[PDB]
Design a binder for this molecule. Structure first.
Ligand code: 1OV
Ligand code: MG
Ligand code: MG
Ligand code: ZN
Length: 889
């Protein structure tokens, strides 16, 4: 397996100036004719001409209209087409080819493939070479003129990049459309779509040049009335890039297309964005609430790529975080401003500190700009995206809004229309940093370490207050654990947004302040501090670190009640829960290890329970925030703090802590579940397809969270409430009624009722499957076998496979059954899946990422299953590289 190294980057000895494609789609085959107008570059040294081309069936290849001869003039090995240099021209020339490919049997969903009755391409990162020969790398920029033909009845709508310049009939019931896209682009941004697509459309007029832009959103006919929210999101996304960044769309039309079979999220092909149906289609009747935020996020993200990815492009795939981390950051700024709820930021932090921190302490740990890869398919990770986003957001924290905007505009102005690397971004921000500090000797060289250093920094604190001098000191230390990528970790430039809270009245004691920690340790002193403060540290989660606040639980409760920053309140709550979890886990572990016949458990802090009740009862406090405070930290966050984690002991620890709090608060929870009904479930705008209320959906989250707490607790008569909830018009509610009924005899009755409500909408059925898969059932293994036999079957749809299996892998008691049966079951599904879709097979490996964090028995059981997968003769290259790296082999 070939290893690609970042420092080995060299420009091609060839240039491709023009691609002219003819893609003729037939019932049993698609024929692709391509002419590349090429040249020799200044880097050329008389080498062979080598094109990528994977899985292509050659009819013929030519140079300047003469056929080449296999063996004597070229070799093709199903991966690389090599033309010996003696036959390669020394000036401008045409290379032409005709190949056959088979989208109907392309179940890997890369290249050109059939999803239900739509033909669609997916080219990022290396899928264009599955369609035709190319030097398939993003620095090869070319013009594209593309013709597509097909059966007109089956494929009436034909789309590609650029302007549609000709439409024509063809004998035999066929038709054709030609699209010409003169601006240069990399091949990964090519797309084509053919299908019987229906649409909604609108015209958008840009803010400054007043250009009319036509917006089209497409799906199959069945679901066309689920497109309205996506169109509203697209308008919002355009407005926001205009408003915050001063950036307008440059083209005359933007198409969005929903397909049923897609490998996660969406894809930013220029003017032709293609989406997983689950991230474009929603209705109030047939979608859970989460779909609304998801579509806003994904439409926004693909829109924002038009500048950060499509106009300023990547030099090579090592720079992936430059488009993805920056687009995720732009996405996050947009979602925060659109939802106006503090839970939007919290949800991003919750994801990073569970999923991405687990990655970064695993054998898979990498920096956001990796140094090498085998499969670029395995580097579209939470590290590259979500830690990359936190690195891109730290420049805004460090600079502030005015100077961040100036630096960003520097980056855009200087690199628009050209390839770029992470350095070019850092350079732009530095120029803004020089301006901000008012000193041209200031630099961000140290900041570059966020791109090259792997692992999560730990930041810890000590304090000092001198009452006579009114002088307060914060002593800060940073440390990153050595790992396989750096033996010696260096200190990072860590911005620490801080406040100082007066514990007597809850007031701010200082103005906005961001500490710039640039050494291994530093002491920040503040004078004229009239009373000893409680420090509010890392406001907004201002760096992607482990925060060790060293505060007492009394101080944490005071921040939780009285601080002004949502993250710090949520984090204080999280730190109270973690101290309790680690204490009880160790008490349970000692009792299990010592086989004790009796033992004691430390109860949950009473003043902390009181603070929760105080917040829940405040009618002016935010419902989405309340749902976070009554929830323990995610299991994947907890595991970062425990060695040899026994999953049964952790399950017993969580049970204890939830029961301790419920034994005090369940009456409060029931009262609020009832008092929240009116506003949470208000149907006033149910038939208004464009009216989306994030606060109201957070009220439903809180009700559904409280309903789960009450059901687990077997609160008196709560089944009455579960049954009534099953009758709600909102799928968030009636699917919740299914999951909480797991604890009652009524579960299979609601299973049938909710299946009936779900089975006729493809996406809603997938949400039903996730609900069943995540259900806290003692008979979950029998239930999964029933889903496999009755509903899933031999579906190759990624959404169906992921819905059936991934939520189950989060079932702490049962997936981690000590027999290893859960690990065995997922390994079988991975290997089965890998035969047709190696990307999804790799996604289904996710529970294995924490294998070396668990108790020694479960470590062995997981390792056994990974080695069994590795031993499969027919293992894919993507699955093999992934499991070798995960198992340190
Ligand atoms: N290899 C993959 N996971 N697919 C790449 C497509 C990712 C898109 N650029 P996005 O980040 O916009 O969803
Ligand atoms: Mg083939
Ligand atoms: Mg289907
Ligand atoms: Zn992206």
């Amino acid at each position: 397996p070939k290893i690609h190294y970042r420092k080995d980057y060299k420009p091609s000895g060839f240039i491709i100036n023009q691609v002219t494609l003819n893609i003729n789609i037939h019932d049993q085959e698609t024929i692709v004719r391509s002419v590349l107008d090429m040249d020799i570059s200044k880097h050329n040294v008389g080498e062979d001409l080598v094109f990528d081309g994977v899985g292509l069936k050659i009819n013929e290849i030519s140079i300047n209209n003469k056929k080449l001869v296999e063996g004597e003039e070229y070799t093709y090995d199903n991966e690389f087409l090599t033309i010996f240099s003696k036959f390669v021209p020394k000036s401008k020339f045409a290379f032409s080819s005709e190949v056959i490919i088979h989208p109907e049997t392309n179940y890997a969903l890369t290249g050109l493939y059939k999803s239900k009755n739509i033909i669609v391409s997916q080219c990022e990162a290396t899928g264009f070479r599955r369609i035709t020969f190319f030097i398939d790398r993003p620095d090869m920029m070319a013009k594209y003129d593309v013709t597509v033909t097909a059966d007109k009845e089956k494929y009436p709508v034909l789309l590609s990049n650029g302007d549609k310049v000709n439409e024509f009939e063809i004998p035999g019931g066929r038709h054709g459309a030609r699209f010409n896209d003169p601006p240069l682009k990399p091949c990964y941004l090519f797309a084509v779509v053919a299908g019987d697509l229906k649409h909604l459309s609108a015209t958008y007029i840009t803010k400054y040049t007043k250009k009319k832009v036509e917006l089209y959103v497409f799906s199959e006919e069945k679901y066309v009335s689920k497109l309205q929210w996506a169109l509203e999101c697209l308008k919002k996304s355009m407005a926001f890039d205009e408003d915050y960044f001063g950036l307008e769309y440059d083209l005359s039309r933007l198409n969005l297309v929903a397909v049923s079979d897609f490998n996660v999220g969406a894809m930013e092909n220029k003017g032709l964005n293609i989406f997983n149906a689950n991230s474009l289609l929603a209705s109030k009747k047939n979608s859970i609430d989460f779909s609304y935020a998801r579509i806003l996020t994904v439409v926004g993200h693909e829109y924002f790529h038009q500048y950060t990815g499509n106009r300023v492009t990547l030099r090579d795939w090592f720079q992936l975080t430059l488009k993805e981390g920056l687009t995720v950051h732009r996405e996050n700024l947009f979602s925060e401003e659109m939802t106006k709820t503090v839970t939007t930021r919290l949800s991003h932090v919750d994801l990073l500190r569970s999923v991405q921190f687990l990655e970064d302490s695993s054998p898979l740990s990498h920096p956001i700009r990796p140094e090498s890869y085998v499969s670029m398919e395995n580097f579209y990770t939470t590290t590259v995206y979500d830690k990359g986003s936190e690195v891109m957001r730290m420049y805004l924290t460090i600079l502030g809004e005015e100077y961040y905007k100036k630096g960003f505009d520097i980056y855009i102005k200087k690199n628009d229309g050209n390839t770029a690397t992470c350095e070019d971004f850092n350079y732009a921000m530095e120029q803004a940093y020089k301006m901000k500090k008012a000193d041209n000797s200031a630099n961000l060289n140290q900041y570059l370490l966020w791109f090259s250093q792997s692992g999560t920094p730990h930041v810890s604190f000590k304090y000092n207050y001198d009452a006579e001098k009114k002088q307060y000191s914060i002593h800060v230390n940073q440390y990153t654990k050595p790992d396989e990528n750096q033996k010696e970790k260096k200190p990072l430039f860590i911005p620490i947004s801080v406040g100082l809270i007066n514990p007597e009245n809850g007031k701010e004691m200082i103005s906005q302040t961001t500490l710039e920690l640039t050494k291994e340790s530093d002491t920040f002193v503040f004078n004229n501090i009239a009373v000893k403060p409680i420090p509010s540290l890392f406001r907004g989660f201002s760096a992607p670190v482990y925060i060790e606040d060293q505060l007492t639980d009394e101080e944490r409760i005071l921040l939780l009640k009285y601080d002004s920053d949502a993250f710090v309140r949520y984090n204080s709550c999280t730190n109270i829960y973690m101290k309790q979890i680690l204490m009880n886990y160790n008490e349970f572990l000692k009792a299990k290890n010592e086989k004790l016949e009796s033992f004691q458990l430390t109860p949950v802090n009473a003043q902390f329970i009181d603070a929760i009740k105080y917040l829940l009862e405040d009618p002016h406090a935010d419902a989405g925030f309340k749902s976070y405070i009554v929830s323990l930290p995610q299991d994947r966050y907890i595991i970062n703090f425990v060695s040899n984690l026994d999953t049964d002991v952790l399950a017993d620890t969580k049970e204890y802590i939830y029961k301790q709090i419920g034994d005090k608060l369940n009456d409060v929870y029931y009262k609020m579940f009832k008092s929240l009904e009116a506003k949470a479930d208000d149907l006033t705008y149910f038939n208004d397809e464009s009216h989306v209320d994030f606060d109201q959906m957070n009220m439903r989250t809180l009700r559904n969270t409280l309903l789960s707490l009450l059901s687990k607790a077997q609160y008196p008569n709560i089944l009455n409430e579960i049954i009534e909830h099953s009758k709600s018009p909102y799928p968030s509610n009636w699917l919740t009624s299914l999951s909480v009924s797991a604890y009652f005899d009524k579960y299979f009755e609601l299973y049938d009722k909710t299946y009936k409500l779900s089975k006729d909408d493809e996406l809603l059925l997938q949400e039903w499957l996730k609900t069943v898969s995540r259900s806290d059932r003692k008979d979950i293994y029998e239930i999964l076998k029933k889903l496999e036999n009755e509903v899933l079957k031999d579906s190759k749809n990624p959404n169906d496979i992921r819905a059936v299996y991934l939520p189950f892998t989060n079932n702490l008691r049962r997936f981690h059954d000590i027999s290893g049966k859960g690990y065995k079951l997922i390994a079988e599904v991975i290997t089965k899946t890998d035969k047709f879709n190696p990307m999804v097979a790799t996604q289904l490996c996710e529970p294995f990422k924490l294998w070396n964090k668990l108790d020694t028995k479960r470590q062995e059981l997981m390792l056994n299953e990974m080695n069994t997968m590795l031993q499969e003769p027919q293992i894919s290259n993507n699955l093999k590289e992934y499991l070798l790296r995960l198992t340190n082999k």
